Design a protein around this ligand. Structure first.
Ligand SMILES: NC(=O)c1ccc[n+]([C@@H]2O[C@H](COP(=O)([O-])OP(=O)(O)OC[C@H]3O[C@@H](n4cnc5c(N)ncnc54)[C@H](OP(=O)(O)O)[C@@H]3O)[C@@H](O)[C@H]2O)c1
Length: 316
């Protein structure tokens, strides 16, 4: 297990990163400082998480203290759905850069394939509760992403939550200048994603697995829901290897050649989650974990199921 994967822009991306969705702003600065101290070199961020300024304070302190050099960090952020318009993309990227205290991102993703009406609200609603869409299509948003590469604001661009047809749409774009480097998708033993991963990998697109622990802090959790960290079958694999259940759930995507971004704000767990480079799951263990698929999603963007570009009607 090598620590970085080569992307199609020629850059190397650390295969383990720290997630920041739901990390409270008064805890995420310490979380990111601890993560960099214990070896993380990849941080996954987004404007919609409302905590980039505090993530940026941590990054800046570790660069100032010379704990790490900027070239050794791999910082990812995402363009929110209300900024898909051509004339809004650069300013969205620059606001994220200003918050993170950076002069470039290593990777900038389209957060969802669905564009929404621009404005202050992240989920603009009609007087009945549906998301109000944008008419911009995702090929014109991709052209605006390509401009950020050519202006030096980002080293790589990619996509998130795109289905196979939508990835194909970008790959078949007339005049395509840069292929997506990454598709960041939900992936864990209850949503194993075989077909979409195979597709992306065959095209040289690296897949990042989000919610690898099943997001037990997601807002909309219902106790009736499946729980990866408590699944006795996964606890038994961890017990066999003398590791924690979370460590098995992080190692699993790594052995599928995925990048993985577990979130924690707890210092002991941040350190434990990084100690996954010293054991191997067998092929039998990997096949067993894959057999737990149930097509269960943490993140289904339920307010957007009539948007033309909603990604999850599609088999994959
Ligand atoms: N592209 C997208 O649309 C999208 C969507 C969802 C997620 N993401 C990205 O993926 C990251 C990871 O997904 P996620 O935040 O949904 O959930 P996750 O990483 O699956 O799970 C995070 C939860 O697990 C807990 N935890 C972490 N390590 C643990 C351990 N060793 N033992 C027990 N519990 C542990 C955390 O608690 P504490 O924090 O209290 O320690 C937190 O409640 C996000 O933070 C975000 O960066 C992207």
């Amino acid at each position: 297990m090598a620590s970085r994967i080569l992307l199609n822009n020629g850059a190397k991306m650390p295969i383990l990163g720290l997630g920041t969705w739901k990390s409270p702003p008064g805890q995420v600065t310490e979380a990111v400082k601890v993560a960099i101290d214990v070896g993380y070199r990849h941080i996954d961020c987004a404007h919609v998480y409302q905590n980039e300024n505090e993530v940026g304070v941590a990054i800046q302190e570790k660069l100032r203290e010379q704990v790490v050099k900027r070239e050794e960090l791999f910082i990812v952020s995402k363009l929110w759905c209300t900024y898909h318009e051509k004339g809004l993309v650069k300013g969205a990227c620059q606001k994220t850069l200003s918050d993170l205290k950076l002069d470039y991102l290593d990777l900038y993703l389209i957060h969802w394939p669905t564009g929404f009406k621009p404005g202050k609200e992240f989920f603009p609603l009609d007087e009945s509760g549906n998301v109000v869409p944008s008419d911009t299509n995702i090929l014109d948003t991709w052209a605006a992403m390509e401009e950020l590469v050519d202006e030096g604001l980002v080293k790589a661009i990619g996509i998130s939550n795109f289905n196979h047809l939508q990835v194909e749409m970008i790959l078949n774009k007339p005049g395509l200048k840069y292929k997506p480097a990454v598709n960041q998708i939900e992936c864990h033993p209850y949503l194993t994603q075989e077909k979409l991963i195979q597709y992306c990998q065959s095209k040289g697109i690296v897949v990042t697995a989000y919610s690898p622990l099943g997001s037990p802090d997601r807002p909309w959790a219902k106790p009736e829901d499946p729980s990866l960290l408590e699944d006795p079958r996964i606890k038994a694999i961890a017990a066999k290897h003398n590791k924690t259940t979370a460590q098995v759930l992080i190692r699993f995507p790594m052995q599928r050649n995925l990048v993985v971004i577990p979130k924690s704000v707890t210092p002991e767990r941040i350190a434990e989650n990084f100690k996954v480079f010293d054991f191997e799951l067998s092929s039998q263990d990997m096949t067993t974990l894959l057999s737990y698929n149930r097509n269960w999603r943490v993140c289904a963007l339920l307010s957007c199921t009539s948007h033309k570009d909603y990604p999850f009607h599609e088999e994959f």
